[model samples]
Target chain A: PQITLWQRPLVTIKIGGQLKEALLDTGADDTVLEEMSLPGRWKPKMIGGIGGFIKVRQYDQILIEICGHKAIGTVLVGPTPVNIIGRNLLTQIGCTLNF
Target chain B: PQITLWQRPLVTIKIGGQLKEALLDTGADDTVLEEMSLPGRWKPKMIGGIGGFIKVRQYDQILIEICGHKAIGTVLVGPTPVNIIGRNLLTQIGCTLNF
Candidate 1:
Protein backbone atom coordinates (compact mmCIF):
# COMPACT_ATOMS: atom_id res chain seq x y z
CA PRO A 1 0.00 0.00 0.00
CA GLN A 2 1.27 3.46 -0.87
CA ILE A 3 0.31 6.40 1.30
CA THR A 4 1.14 10.03 0.66
CA LEU A 5 1.55 12.53 3.47
CA TRP A 6 0.12 16.00 3.05
CA GLN A 7 1.95 19.27 3.49
CA ARG A 8 0.35 22.32 5.06
CA PRO A 9 -0.06 25.73 3.42
CA LEU A 10 1.73 28.92 4.40
CA VAL A 11 0.03 32.21 5.33
CA THR A 12 1.16 35.72 4.53
CA ILE A 13 0.67 38.70 6.85
CA LYS A 14 1.48 42.38 6.36
CA ILE A 15 3.84 43.95 8.83
CA GLY A 16 2.84 47.04 10.85
CA GLY A 17 -0.78 46.93 9.77
CA GLN A 18 0.24 47.57 6.20
CA LEU A 19 -2.03 46.65 3.35
CA LYS A 20 -2.07 43.18 1.83
CA GLU A 21 1.37 43.72 0.42
CA ALA A 22 4.19 41.89 2.14
CA LEU A 23 6.18 38.68 2.10
CA LEU A 24 4.50 35.50 3.29
CA ASP A 25 6.71 32.62 4.32
CA THR A 26 5.36 29.53 6.11
CA GLY A 27 8.84 28.19 6.76
CA ALA A 28 9.22 30.89 9.39
CA ASP A 29 8.44 29.57 12.87
CA ASP A 30 7.81 32.78 14.81
CA THR A 31 6.77 36.26 13.79
CA VAL A 32 9.68 38.68 14.11
CA LEU A 33 8.25 42.15 14.87
CA GLU A 34 10.63 45.04 14.30
CA GLU A 35 10.90 47.48 17.17
CA MET A 36 10.14 50.41 14.92
CA SER A 37 6.73 49.03 13.96
CA LEU A 38 5.50 48.91 17.54
CA PRO A 39 3.75 51.80 19.24
CA GLY A 40 4.91 53.15 22.55
CA ARG A 41 3.84 51.42 25.84
CA TRP A 42 4.19 47.81 24.68
CA LYS A 43 6.29 45.78 27.12
CA PRO A 44 8.16 42.71 25.84
CA LYS A 45 9.61 39.98 27.97
CA MET A 46 13.27 39.20 28.40
CA ILE A 47 13.86 35.60 27.40
CA GLY A 48 16.92 33.56 26.58
CA GLY A 49 18.42 33.26 23.10
CA ILE A 50 20.23 30.51 21.22
CA GLY A 51 23.45 32.50 21.38
CA GLY A 52 23.55 32.45 25.16
CA PHE A 53 20.85 34.08 27.26
CA ILE A 54 19.03 37.32 26.66
CA LYS A 55 15.87 39.12 27.56
CA VAL A 56 13.10 39.13 24.93
CA ARG A 57 10.13 41.13 26.11
CA GLN A 58 6.60 40.40 24.90
CA TYR A 59 4.76 43.43 23.66
CA ASP A 60 1.25 43.02 22.32
CA GLN A 61 -1.05 40.35 20.97
CA ILE A 62 -2.70 42.42 18.32
CA LEU A 63 -5.84 41.13 16.70
CA ILE A 64 -5.05 41.13 13.01
CA GLU A 65 -8.52 42.46 12.41
CA ILE A 66 -8.74 41.62 8.72
CA CYS A 67 -12.17 42.15 7.23
CA GLY A 68 -13.97 41.14 10.42
CA HIS A 69 -11.68 38.09 10.71
CA LYS A 70 -8.89 38.27 13.24
CA ALA A 71 -5.99 36.39 14.86
CA ILE A 72 -4.44 37.10 18.23
CA GLY A 73 -0.89 36.35 19.32
CA THR A 74 2.11 37.81 21.12
CA VAL A 75 4.87 39.80 19.47
CA LEU A 76 8.49 39.95 20.54
CA VAL A 77 9.98 43.34 21.32
CA GLY A 78 13.60 44.16 20.81
CA PRO A 79 15.94 45.65 18.26
CA THR A 80 15.08 44.32 14.82
CA PRO A 81 15.55 45.87 11.39
CA VAL A 82 12.28 44.59 9.91
CA ASN A 83 9.04 42.93 10.92
CA ILE A 84 8.06 39.40 9.90
CA ILE A 85 4.98 37.28 10.54
CA GLY A 86 6.03 33.71 11.07
CA ARG A 87 4.10 30.44 10.81
CA ASN A 88 3.33 30.04 14.50
CA LEU A 89 0.61 32.72 14.71
CA LEU A 90 -0.55 32.20 11.14
CA THR A 91 -1.41 28.56 11.74
CA GLN A 92 -3.59 29.59 14.64
CA ILE A 93 -5.45 32.09 12.52
CA GLY A 94 -6.33 29.60 9.78
CA CYS A 95 -4.86 31.85 7.11
CA THR A 96 -3.98 30.86 3.56
CA LEU A 97 -1.77 32.75 1.17
CA ASN A 98 -2.92 33.68 -2.29
CA PHE A 99 0.51 34.24 -3.88
CA PRO B 1 27.14 56.43 14.98
CA GLN B 2 27.68 52.96 13.56
CA ILE B 3 25.95 50.31 15.65
CA THR B 4 26.18 46.58 15.10
CA LEU B 5 23.42 44.39 16.54
CA TRP B 6 24.41 40.89 17.58
CA GLN B 7 22.81 37.86 16.05
CA ARG B 8 21.77 34.98 18.23
CA PRO B 9 23.35 31.51 17.97
CA LEU B 10 21.46 28.35 17.14
CA VAL B 11 21.43 25.37 19.50
CA THR B 12 21.54 21.68 18.67
CA ILE B 13 19.45 19.23 20.67
CA LYS B 14 19.33 15.46 20.39
CA ILE B 15 15.90 14.13 19.60
CA GLY B 16 14.23 11.09 21.28
CA GLY B 17 16.39 11.11 24.37
CA GLN B 18 19.24 9.98 22.21
CA LEU B 19 22.84 11.12 22.41
CA LYS B 20 24.04 14.48 21.11
CA GLU B 21 23.55 13.85 17.40
CA ALA B 22 20.96 15.81 15.50
CA LEU B 23 20.56 18.77 13.19
CA LEU B 24 20.12 22.02 15.16
CA ASP B 25 18.33 24.77 13.32
CA THR B 26 17.61 28.04 15.13
CA GLY B 27 15.77 29.12 12.08
CA ALA B 28 13.12 26.58 13.05
CA ASP B 29 10.44 28.31 15.14
CA ASP B 30 8.88 25.35 16.90
CA THR B 31 9.97 21.76 17.39
CA VAL B 32 8.27 19.17 15.25
CA LEU B 33 8.07 15.87 17.13
CA GLU B 34 7.66 12.66 15.21
CA GLU B 35 4.83 10.31 16.08
CA MET B 36 7.09 7.28 16.18
CA SER B 37 9.61 8.89 18.53
CA LEU B 38 7.03 9.53 21.22
CA PRO B 39 6.63 7.09 24.11
CA GLY B 40 3.11 6.17 23.00
CA ARG B 41 1.25 8.36 25.50
CA TRP B 42 1.39 11.96 24.42
CA LYS B 43 -1.49 14.09 23.13
CA PRO B 44 -0.93 17.17 20.92
CA LYS B 45 -3.38 19.94 20.09
CA MET B 46 -4.45 20.72 16.55
CA ILE B 47 -5.69 24.24 17.09
CA GLY B 48 -5.88 25.42 13.49
CA GLY B 49 -4.01 25.46 10.22
CA ILE B 50 -2.97 28.12 7.78
CA GLY B 51 -5.33 26.44 5.33
CA GLY B 52 -8.16 25.95 7.81
CA PHE B 53 -8.96 25.30 11.45
CA ILE B 54 -7.51 22.17 13.07
CA LYS B 55 -7.25 20.76 16.54
CA VAL B 56 -3.67 20.37 17.88
CA ARG B 57 -3.66 18.68 21.29
CA GLN B 58 -0.90 19.42 23.75
CA TYR B 59 1.24 16.50 24.86
CA ASP B 60 4.14 16.64 27.28
CA GLN B 61 6.65 19.21 28.30
CA ILE B 62 9.78 17.13 28.24
CA LEU B 63 12.75 18.29 30.23
CA ILE B 64 15.71 18.02 27.95
CA GLU B 65 18.13 17.16 30.70
CA ILE B 66 21.49 17.85 29.08
CA CYS B 67 24.85 17.84 30.82
CA GLY B 68 23.12 18.01 34.21
CA HIS B 69 21.13 21.01 33.01
CA LYS B 70 17.60 20.90 31.68
CA ALA B 71 14.96 22.97 29.88
CA ILE B 72 11.24 22.40 30.10
CA GLY B 73 8.68 23.04 27.37
CA THR B 74 5.65 21.55 25.68
CA VAL B 75 5.66 19.37 22.56
CA LEU B 76 3.08 19.04 19.85
CA VAL B 77 1.70 15.61 19.10
CA GLY B 78 0.67 14.79 15.57
CA PRO B 79 1.72 12.73 12.59
CA THR B 80 5.14 14.13 11.77
CA PRO B 81 7.80 11.96 10.16
CA VAL B 82 10.79 13.45 11.97
CA ASN B 83 11.38 15.11 15.35
CA ILE B 84 12.95 18.55 15.54
CA ILE B 85 14.25 20.79 18.32
CA GLY B 86 13.18 24.28 17.37
CA ARG B 87 14.46 27.74 18.28
CA ASN B 88 11.71 28.45 20.79
CA LEU B 89 12.84 25.66 23.08
CA LEU B 90 16.52 26.26 22.43
CA THR B 91 16.26 29.94 23.25
CA GLN B 92 14.41 29.17 26.46
CA ILE B 93 17.23 26.85 27.50
CA GLY B 94 19.93 29.35 26.63
CA CYS B 95 21.62 26.92 24.27
CA THR B 96 24.23 27.77 21.65
CA LEU B 97 25.21 25.55 18.76
CA ASN B 98 28.82 24.70 18.14
CA PHE B 99 28.35 23.74 14.50
Candidate 2:
Protein backbone atom coordinates (compact mmCIF):
# COMPACT_ATOMS: atom_id res chain seq x y z
CA PRO A 1 0.00 0.00 0.00
CA GLN A 2 1.05 3.62 -0.71
CA ILE A 3 0.51 6.70 1.37
CA THR A 4 -0.20 10.12 -0.08
CA LEU A 5 2.27 12.67 1.31
CA TRP A 6 -0.34 14.69 3.08
CA GLN A 7 0.21 17.33 5.77
CA ARG A 8 1.87 14.76 8.00
CA PRO A 9 2.91 11.34 6.74
CA LEU A 10 1.78 9.50 9.84
CA VAL A 11 1.62 5.72 10.19
CA THR A 12 0.83 3.00 12.66
CA ILE A 13 3.80 1.22 14.14
CA LYS A 14 4.20 -1.78 16.43
CA ILE A 15 7.23 -1.81 18.70
CA GLY A 16 8.05 -3.73 21.84
CA GLY A 17 4.73 -5.50 21.37
CA GLN A 18 2.86 -2.22 21.53
CA LEU A 19 1.07 -0.21 18.85
CA LYS A 20 1.75 3.47 18.35
CA GLU A 21 1.67 6.23 15.78
CA ALA A 22 4.76 7.89 14.37
CA LEU A 23 5.58 10.51 11.79
CA LEU A 24 7.43 9.44 8.70
CA ASP A 25 10.12 12.12 8.98
CA THR A 26 12.38 11.97 6.02
CA GLY A 27 13.81 15.17 7.39
CA ALA A 28 15.21 13.27 10.33
CA ASP A 29 18.33 11.14 10.29
CA ASP A 30 17.47 8.65 13.03
CA THR A 31 14.28 7.21 14.41
CA VAL A 32 13.20 8.86 17.65
CA LEU A 33 10.36 7.58 19.77
CA GLU A 34 8.73 8.93 22.87
CA GLU A 35 10.26 7.33 25.95
CA MET A 36 9.36 3.66 25.94
CA SER A 37 10.49 0.41 27.49
CA LEU A 38 12.62 -1.99 25.47
CA PRO A 39 13.67 -5.47 26.46
CA GLY A 40 17.39 -4.93 25.98
CA ARG A 41 20.13 -2.60 27.08
CA TRP A 42 21.14 0.55 25.15
CA LYS A 43 23.73 3.27 24.95
CA PRO A 44 23.38 6.84 26.08
CA LYS A 45 22.86 8.99 23.01
CA MET A 46 22.16 12.51 21.94
CA ILE A 47 20.80 14.14 18.77
CA GLY A 48 20.58 17.64 17.42
CA GLY A 49 18.14 19.05 14.87
CA ILE A 50 15.70 21.90 14.23
CA GLY A 51 15.15 22.37 17.94
CA GLY A 52 18.69 22.08 19.15
CA PHE A 53 20.02 18.90 20.79
CA ILE A 54 18.28 16.24 22.82
CA LYS A 55 19.46 13.39 25.04
CA VAL A 56 18.23 9.92 24.24
CA ARG A 57 18.75 6.23 24.78
CA GLN A 58 19.96 4.40 21.69
CA TYR A 59 18.76 0.83 21.32
CA ASP A 60 20.24 -1.10 18.46
CA GLN A 61 18.71 -4.00 16.56
CA ILE A 62 15.12 -3.31 17.53
CA LEU A 63 12.19 -4.51 15.48
CA ILE A 64 9.70 -1.94 14.30
CA GLU A 65 6.70 -2.48 12.04
CA ILE A 66 5.69 0.40 9.82
CA CYS A 67 2.52 0.20 7.84
CA GLY A 68 2.81 -3.59 8.06
CA HIS A 69 6.41 -3.56 6.85
CA LYS A 70 8.79 -5.17 9.31
CA ALA A 71 12.13 -3.44 9.96
CA ILE A 72 14.99 -4.04 12.37
CA GLY A 73 17.31 -1.18 13.20
CA THR A 74 18.25 1.38 15.82
CA VAL A 75 15.60 3.11 17.83
CA LEU A 76 16.29 6.23 19.90
CA VAL A 77 14.13 6.71 22.93
CA GLY A 78 14.03 10.28 24.16
CA PRO A 79 11.91 13.23 25.15
CA THR A 80 10.61 13.95 21.71
CA PRO A 81 7.48 15.98 21.17
CA VAL A 82 6.55 13.66 18.32
CA ASN A 83 7.42 10.07 17.45
CA ILE A 84 9.38 10.12 14.20
CA ILE A 85 10.40 7.25 11.96
CA GLY A 86 13.36 8.75 10.19
CA ARG A 87 15.26 7.95 6.99
CA ASN A 88 17.52 5.43 8.69
CA LEU A 89 14.61 2.98 8.71
CA LEU A 90 13.01 4.44 5.61
CA THR A 91 15.99 3.50 3.48
CA GLN A 92 15.85 -0.06 4.76
CA ILE A 93 12.21 -0.23 3.74
CA GLY A 94 13.01 1.01 0.21
CA CYS A 95 11.32 4.40 0.40
CA THR A 96 11.67 6.58 -2.67
CA LEU A 97 11.06 10.29 -3.10
CA ASN A 98 9.14 10.79 -6.33
CA PHE A 99 7.29 13.66 -7.88
CA PRO B 1 16.09 14.09 -11.09
CA GLN B 2 15.18 12.03 -8.05
CA ILE B 3 16.45 12.49 -4.50
CA THR B 4 17.23 9.47 -2.38
CA LEU B 5 15.52 9.60 0.95
CA TRP B 6 18.62 9.72 3.08
CA GLN B 7 18.73 10.65 6.73
CA ARG B 8 17.02 13.91 5.92
CA PRO B 9 15.29 14.67 2.64
CA LEU B 10 16.85 18.09 2.17
CA VAL B 11 16.62 20.15 -1.01
CA THR B 12 17.89 23.49 -2.26
CA ILE B 13 15.38 26.23 -2.89
CA LYS B 14 15.37 29.85 -4.07
CA ILE B 15 12.89 32.26 -2.60
CA GLY B 16 12.91 36.04 -2.24
CA GLY B 17 15.96 35.97 -4.53
CA GLN B 18 17.82 34.01 -1.87
CA LEU B 19 18.95 30.40 -1.97
CA LYS B 20 18.43 28.13 1.00
CA GLU B 21 18.12 24.48 1.95
CA ALA B 22 14.86 23.17 3.29
CA LEU B 23 13.56 19.86 4.57
CA LEU B 24 10.88 18.02 2.63
CA ASP B 25 8.70 17.72 5.69
CA THR B 26 5.64 15.80 4.65
CA GLY B 27 4.70 15.78 8.30
CA ALA B 28 4.07 19.49 8.11
CA ASP B 29 0.87 21.03 6.82
CA ASP B 30 2.01 24.40 5.45
CA THR B 31 5.35 25.63 4.22
CA VAL B 32 7.28 27.33 7.04
CA LEU B 33 10.38 29.33 6.23
CA GLU B 34 12.93 30.41 8.77
CA GLU B 35 12.29 34.13 9.29
CA MET B 36 12.57 35.92 5.94
CA SER B 37 11.16 38.84 4.00
CA LEU B 38 8.47 37.73 1.59
CA PRO B 39 7.18 39.75 -1.33
CA GLY B 40 3.62 41.08 -1.35
CA ARG B 41 1.23 41.28 1.57
CA TRP B 42 0.88 38.58 4.16
CA LYS B 43 -1.10 37.78 7.25
CA PRO B 44 0.00 36.82 10.72
CA LYS B 45 -0.36 33.14 11.45
CA MET B 46 0.57 30.45 13.96
CA ILE B 47 1.58 26.78 13.65
CA GLY B 48 2.00 23.70 15.84
CA GLY B 49 4.18 20.59 15.55
CA ILE B 50 6.62 18.20 17.23
CA GLY B 51 7.87 20.46 19.99
CA GLY B 52 4.88 22.75 20.15
CA PHE B 53 3.27 25.72 18.40
CA ILE B 54 4.79 28.97 17.22
CA LYS B 55 3.68 32.23 15.54
CA VAL B 56 4.19 32.85 11.85
CA ARG B 57 3.46 35.09 8.87
CA GLN B 58 1.35 33.71 6.07
CA TYR B 59 1.93 34.73 2.45
CA ASP B 60 -0.58 33.72 -0.18
CA GLN B 61 -0.12 33.25 -3.93
CA ILE B 62 3.64 33.35 -3.83
CA LEU B 63 5.86 31.34 -6.12
CA ILE B 64 8.40 28.86 -4.73
CA GLU B 65 10.72 26.68 -6.77
CA ILE B 66 11.54 23.23 -5.43
CA CYS B 67 13.74 20.67 -7.14
CA GLY B 68 13.00 22.45 -10.44
CA HIS B 69 9.27 22.40 -9.79
CA LYS B 70 7.39 25.67 -9.36
CA ALA B 71 4.77 25.79 -6.62
CA ILE B 72 2.52 28.76 -5.96
CA GLY B 73 0.52 28.77 -2.77
CA THR B 74 0.51 29.72 0.89
CA VAL B 75 3.85 29.98 2.70
CA LEU B 76 4.26 30.87 6.34
CA VAL B 77 7.28 32.69 7.69
CA GLY B 78 8.42 33.15 11.24
CA PRO B 79 10.74 31.74 13.87
CA THR B 80 11.09 28.09 12.88
CA PRO B 81 13.68 25.60 14.02
CA VAL B 82 13.93 24.49 10.41
CA ASN B 83 12.76 25.39 6.92
CA ILE B 84 10.07 22.89 6.09
CA ILE B 85 8.32 22.41 2.75
CA GLY B 86 5.01 20.87 3.64
CA ARG B 87 2.52 18.70 1.75
CA ASN B 88 0.52 21.73 0.66
CA LEU B 89 3.39 22.70 -1.62
CA LEU B 90 4.59 19.16 -2.18
CA THR B 91 1.25 18.11 -3.67
CA GLN B 92 1.28 21.05 -6.04
CA ILE B 93 4.60 19.78 -7.37
CA GLY B 94 3.30 16.22 -7.69
CA CYS B 95 5.30 14.60 -4.88
CA THR B 96 4.53 11.04 -3.90
CA LEU B 97 5.35 8.78 -0.95
CA ASN B 98 6.52 5.49 -2.43
CA PHE B 99 8.22 2.73 -0.51
Candidate 3:
Protein backbone atom coordinates (compact mmCIF):
# COMPACT_ATOMS: atom_id res chain seq x y z
CA PRO A 1 0.00 0.00 0.00
CA GLN A 2 1.09 3.53 -0.81
CA ILE A 3 -0.21 6.32 1.37
CA THR A 4 0.23 9.98 0.51
CA LEU A 5 0.99 12.29 3.43
CA TRP A 6 -1.60 14.89 2.46
CA GLN A 7 -3.47 13.79 5.58
CA ARG A 8 -2.60 12.00 8.82
CA PRO A 9 -1.28 8.56 7.96
CA LEU A 10 -3.84 6.69 10.01
CA VAL A 11 -4.77 3.04 9.51
CA THR A 12 -6.89 0.35 11.07
CA ILE A 13 -5.30 -1.95 13.58
CA LYS A 14 -6.53 -5.05 15.35
CA ILE A 15 -5.12 -5.60 18.80
CA GLY A 16 -6.33 -7.87 21.55
CA GLY A 17 -9.44 -8.80 19.56
CA GLN A 18 -10.47 -5.15 19.18
CA LEU A 19 -10.17 -2.85 16.18
CA LYS A 20 -8.61 0.58 16.52
CA GLU A 21 -7.18 3.40 14.45
CA ALA A 22 -3.54 4.42 14.72
CA LEU A 23 -1.19 6.85 13.10
CA LEU A 24 2.01 5.71 11.43
CA ASP A 25 4.49 8.04 13.08
CA THR A 26 7.97 8.03 11.70
CA GLY A 27 8.94 10.71 14.20
CA ALA A 28 8.22 8.59 17.25
CA ASP A 29 10.56 5.86 18.47
CA ASP A 30 8.07 3.78 20.43
CA THR A 31 4.46 2.77 19.89
CA VAL A 32 2.02 4.39 22.33
CA LEU A 33 -1.64 3.66 22.75
CA GLU A 34 -4.59 4.97 24.75
CA GLU A 35 -5.08 3.53 28.18
CA MET A 36 -6.48 0.05 27.91
CA SER A 37 -6.49 -3.25 29.78
CA LEU A 38 -4.25 -6.05 28.65
CA PRO A 39 -3.80 -9.55 30.07
CA GLY A 40 -0.23 -9.33 31.20
CA ARG A 41 2.14 -7.74 33.67
CA TRP A 42 3.62 -4.48 32.45
CA LYS A 43 6.31 -2.19 33.78
CA PRO A 44 5.88 1.50 34.44
CA LYS A 45 7.72 3.73 32.00
CA MET A 46 7.94 7.35 31.01
CA ILE A 47 7.95 8.79 27.49
CA GLY A 48 8.73 12.31 26.38
CA GLY A 49 7.27 14.34 23.54
CA ILE A 50 7.28 17.95 22.42
CA GLY A 51 5.78 19.33 25.61
CA GLY A 52 6.91 16.95 28.38
CA PHE A 53 6.89 13.39 29.63
CA ILE A 54 4.11 11.05 30.68
CA LYS A 55 4.13 7.84 32.67
CA VAL A 56 2.80 4.80 30.83
CA ARG A 57 2.42 1.04 31.19
CA GLN A 58 4.89 -0.73 28.98
CA TYR A 59 3.71 -4.07 27.54
CA ASP A 60 6.26 -5.99 25.54
CA GLN A 61 5.77 -8.66 22.88
CA ILE A 62 2.27 -7.53 22.04
CA LEU A 63 0.67 -8.80 18.85
CA ILE A 64 -1.01 -6.06 16.78
CA GLU A 65 -2.43 -6.41 13.31
CA ILE A 66 -1.75 -3.16 11.46
CA CYS A 67 -3.71 -2.71 8.25
CA GLY A 68 -4.08 -6.46 8.09
CA HIS A 69 -0.35 -6.95 8.53
CA LYS A 70 0.63 -8.60 11.79
CA ALA A 71 3.41 -7.26 13.99
CA ILE A 72 4.67 -7.94 17.49
CA GLY A 73 6.58 -5.46 19.63
CA THR A 74 6.49 -3.27 22.71
CA VAL A 75 3.35 -1.20 23.24
CA LEU A 76 3.04 1.64 25.73
CA VAL A 77 -0.40 2.39 27.11
CA GLY A 78 -0.93 5.92 28.33
CA PRO A 79 -3.03 9.07 28.11
CA THR A 80 -2.48 9.82 24.47
CA PRO A 81 -4.96 11.73 22.30
CA VAL A 82 -4.39 9.32 19.43
CA ASN A 83 -2.90 5.84 19.06
CA ILE A 84 0.54 6.03 17.48
CA ILE A 85 2.29 3.15 15.65
CA GLY A 86 5.90 4.22 15.84
CA ARG A 87 9.12 2.93 14.31
CA ASN A 88 9.35 -0.11 16.57
CA LEU A 89 6.31 -1.78 15.02
CA LEU A 90 6.45 0.01 11.72
CA THR A 91 9.64 -1.88 10.90
CA GLN A 92 8.00 -5.17 11.76
CA ILE A 93 5.19 -4.45 9.31
CA GLY A 94 7.66 -3.58 6.57
CA CYS A 95 6.49 0.03 6.42
CA THR A 96 8.68 2.68 4.90
CA LEU A 97 8.82 6.25 3.71
CA ASN A 98 9.30 6.99 0.04
CA PHE A 99 9.47 9.93 -2.29
CA PRO B 1 14.29 7.55 -2.14
CA GLN B 2 12.87 4.86 0.06
CA ILE B 3 13.51 5.06 3.80
CA THR B 4 13.08 2.03 6.02
CA LEU B 5 11.39 2.36 9.39
CA TRP B 6 14.23 0.52 11.15
CA GLN B 7 15.67 3.99 11.85
CA ARG B 8 14.30 7.46 12.39
CA PRO B 9 13.46 9.11 9.07
CA LEU B 10 15.67 12.11 9.68
CA VAL B 11 16.50 14.27 6.68
CA THR B 12 18.54 17.38 6.06
CA ILE B 13 16.63 20.55 5.35
CA LYS B 14 17.67 24.07 4.43
CA ILE B 15 15.66 26.74 6.17
CA GLY B 16 16.52 30.42 6.55
CA GLY B 17 19.93 29.85 5.00
CA GLN B 18 20.86 27.18 7.56
CA LEU B 19 20.93 23.40 7.27
CA LYS B 20 19.32 21.28 9.93
CA GLU B 21 18.01 17.74 10.43
CA ALA B 22 14.31 17.00 10.87
CA LEU B 23 12.15 13.97 11.30
CA LEU B 24 9.52 13.15 8.70
CA ASP B 25 6.46 12.80 10.88
CA THR B 26 3.37 11.34 9.29
CA GLY B 27 1.47 11.50 12.57
CA ALA B 28 1.77 15.23 13.20
CA ASP B 29 -0.70 17.66 11.67
CA ASP B 30 1.63 20.66 11.57
CA THR B 31 5.32 21.15 11.29
CA VAL B 32 7.08 22.24 14.48
CA LEU B 33 10.66 23.36 14.86
CA GLU B 34 13.03 24.07 17.71
CA GLU B 35 13.70 27.61 18.92
CA MET B 36 14.89 29.67 15.99
CA SER B 37 14.63 33.16 14.62
CA LEU B 38 12.71 33.85 11.46
CA PRO B 39 11.93 37.22 9.98
CA GLY B 40 8.17 37.32 9.75
CA ARG B 41 4.98 38.33 11.44
CA TRP B 42 3.68 35.40 13.43
CA LYS B 43 0.71 34.59 15.58
CA PRO B 44 0.58 32.85 18.93
CA LYS B 45 -0.82 29.35 18.85
CA MET B 46 -1.00 26.28 21.03
CA ILE B 47 -0.68 22.68 19.83
CA GLY B 48 -1.36 19.53 21.85
CA GLY B 49 0.28 16.11 21.79
CA ILE B 50 0.64 13.00 23.94
CA GLY B 51 1.63 14.80 27.13
CA GLY B 52 0.35 18.40 26.86
CA PHE B 53 0.11 21.54 24.80
CA ILE B 54 2.76 24.17 24.17
CA LYS B 55 2.53 27.80 23.14
CA VAL B 56 4.31 28.41 19.85
CA ARG B 57 4.99 31.11 17.32
CA GLN B 58 3.34 30.22 14.03
CA TYR B 59 4.90 31.61 10.86
CA ASP B 60 2.91 31.15 7.67
CA GLN B 61 4.23 30.48 4.20
CA ILE B 62 7.80 29.82 5.22
CA LEU B 63 10.13 28.53 2.53
CA ILE B 64 11.95 25.34 3.46
CA GLU B 65 14.06 22.99 1.37
CA ILE B 66 13.45 19.51 2.70
CA CYS B 67 15.86 16.87 1.47
CA GLY B 68 16.55 19.12 -1.54
CA HIS B 69 12.83 19.42 -2.26
CA LYS B 70 11.51 22.96 -1.85
CA ALA B 71 8.32 23.39 0.14
CA ILE B 72 6.53 26.43 1.54
CA GLY B 73 4.05 26.19 4.40
CA THR B 74 3.28 27.15 7.96
CA VAL B 75 6.01 26.32 10.49
CA LEU B 76 5.67 26.51 14.26
CA VAL B 77 8.66 27.38 16.47
CA GLY B 78 8.77 26.35 20.08
CA PRO B 79 10.72 24.38 22.67
CA THR B 80 10.66 21.09 20.81
CA PRO B 81 13.44 18.56 21.29
CA VAL B 82 13.51 17.71 17.59
CA ASN B 83 12.44 19.42 14.37
CA ILE B 84 9.43 17.74 12.76
CA ILE B 85 8.41 17.95 9.12
CA GLY B 86 4.71 17.26 9.05
CA ARG B 87 2.14 16.45 6.38
CA ASN B 88 1.80 20.03 5.28
CA LEU B 89 5.30 19.96 3.83
CA LEU B 90 5.52 16.25 3.20
CA THR B 91 2.86 16.49 0.51
CA GLN B 92 4.80 19.24 -1.18
CA ILE B 93 7.83 17.00 -1.37
CA GLY B 94 5.78 14.11 -2.78
CA CYS B 95 6.43 11.98 0.28
CA THR B 96 4.37 8.89 1.01
CA LEU B 97 4.18 5.83 3.20
CA ASN B 98 4.75 2.52 1.52
CA PHE B 99 4.78 -1.12 2.44
Per-residue lDDT of model 2, residues B3-99, tens digit only? 6775567888888778899988766777899988777888887787644567888899988899778888899898788899988898888887787
| Candidate 3 wrongly placed segments (more than 4 Å) | none
Candidate 2 stretches with Cα past 4 Å from truth are A49-52
Give the Cα lDDT of each candidate. 0.43, 0.83, 0.91
RMSDs, each prediction? 17.2, 2.2, 0.8
Interface RMSD for each of the candidates: 19.3, 2.4, 0.8
Q: For candidate 3, what is the lDDT?
A: 0.91
Per-residue error for A71 in candidate 1, Å, reads 1.5
Which pairs clash inside model 2?
none
| Model 3 lDDT tens row, B66-99 | 8788999999999878999988899989989998
lDDT of 1 by residue, A1-99 (tens): 111112112234544565442222233445545444555356645533222223445656665532334667766655433344555554554443210
How would you class the docking of model 3?
high
Which ten-residue region of model 1 chain B has the weakest summed lDDT? Answer: B1-10
